[PDB]
Write a protein that binds this ligand. Structure first.
Ligand SMILES: [Cl-]
Ligand SMILES: [Fe+3]
Ligand code: NA
Ligand code: NA
Ligand code: NA
Length: 108
């Protein structure tokens, strides 16, 4: 299995933590200065909140797919490259959509 990662740059981290705790009925899995994440089972989602400093509105930071093991990351990396996309591998692999939105496929 795998789940989507959504990372949002938010103007107010504390405000956003409260909102998302209510929306998904669970508290954050990890909290750091300027950073929080939620691990949501239903719907399957890794939500990342990154505080933006002087942001007027929430915007997309990056997107991703969190997968079960490094083998899956390698499979995705090879398949994406075979499909003709430019990739950057780190475990994770990055690709960028034509409008500039970045995607990471990674394992935690
Ligand atoms: Cl924590
Ligand atoms: Fe991420
Ligand atoms: Na802090
Ligand atoms: Na849930
Ligand atoms: Na994928």
């Amino acid at each position: 299995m795998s789940r989507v990662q959504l990372a949002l740059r938010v103007p107010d981290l504390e405000a956003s933590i409260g909102f998302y705790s209510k929306l998904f009925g669970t508290g954050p899995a990890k909290v750091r200065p300027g950073y929080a994440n939620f691990a949501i089972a239903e719907p399957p989602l890794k939500l990342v909140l990154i505080e933006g400093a002087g942001e007027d509105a929430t915007r997309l930071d990056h997107l991703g797919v969190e997968v079960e093991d490094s083998a899956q990351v390698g499979h995705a990396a090879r398949r994406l490259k075979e499909s003709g996309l430019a990739t950057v591998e780190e475990d994770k692999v990055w690709v960028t959509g034509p409008g500039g939105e970045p995607w990471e496929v990674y394992v935690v």
